[PDB]
């Protein structure tokens, strides 16, 4: 086509979605991790994670307001990944890298799994 | 902080939100324009438009599944702006620029109003 494109549009949209999350506006699901609860928007979770995409396209699960993750999932690793989904920023540290990679593998967040693998390989 | 950032994350999120719109997945509102209906996600509409932000933060309107726009709004101008919201691409043409700018002013999409004003000024 003959479209023009606004370079900062996608980043501005994600920044606003994160502002709605902060203020708990139109959040439609609670993710439960080892008795730690995280409110979010189903569509953002689906846009970022192969696991949530599969969950919320399922005819029965699409209607659930509460999703319980596998008990092996670490709440801090989940929190870091939820922050990444809404900001593009990943708080990757020596002390959390193993939990973050394990959570990203479970959530099916391929780009995060990739950078964790590379950061672990650099330290060996 | 000491975060790393994935450059393409925001664009990938918006691309996936547009794929959900195309497949009519988790769309939660119908926007009615001069008897033309457009399905969308409330959160994306709020993230892009000052008007939708005001509508869906209102305690009564946040619960509506149908929103009727002012009868002066042109369905084609709305369609072009809805496409921009989900893609960052604006199909601005000599034949639609007036309707697009009028719709962007009503929707409170300041960056679109800005480029329309500049494109109109170049033609005078």
């Amino acid at each position: 086509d003959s479209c023009i494109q606004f370079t900062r549009h996608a980043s501005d949209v994600l920044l606003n979605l994160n502002r709605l999350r902060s203020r708990d506006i139109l959040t439609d699901v609670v993710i439960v991790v080892s008795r730690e609860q995280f409110r979010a928007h189903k569509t953002v979770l689906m846009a970022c994670s192969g696991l949530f995409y599969s969950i919320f396209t399922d005819q029965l699960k699409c209607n659930l307001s509460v999703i319980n993750l596998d008990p092996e999932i670490n709440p801090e690793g989940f929190c870091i990944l939820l922050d990444f989904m809404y900001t593009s920023r990943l708080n990757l540290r020596e002390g959390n890298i193993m939990a973050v990679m394990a959570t990203a593998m479970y959530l099916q967040m391929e780009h995060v799994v990739d950078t964790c693998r590379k950061f672990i390989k650099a330290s060996e | 902080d000491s975060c790393i950032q994935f450059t393409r994350h925001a664009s990938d999120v918006l691309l996936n939100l547009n794929r959900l719109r195309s497949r009519d997945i988790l769309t939660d509102v119908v926007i009615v324009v001069s008897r033309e209906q457009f399905r969308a996600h409330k959160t994306v509409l709020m993230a892009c438009s000052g008007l939708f932000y005001s509508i869906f933060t209102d305690q009564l309107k946040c619960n509506l599944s149908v929103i009727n726009l002012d009868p002066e709004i042109n369905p084609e101008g709305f369609c072009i702006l809805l496409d921009f919201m989900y893609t960052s691409r604006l199909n601005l043409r000599e034949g639609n620029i007036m309707a697009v700018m009028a719709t962007a002013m009503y929707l409170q999409m300041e960056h679109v109003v800005d480029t329309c004003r500049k494109f109109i000024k170049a033609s005078e």
Binding site: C3, I4, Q5, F6 | -
Partner: peptide, 4 residues
């Protein structure tokens, strides 16, 4: 704004 840019030409994509």
């Amino acid at each position: 704004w840019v030409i994509p």
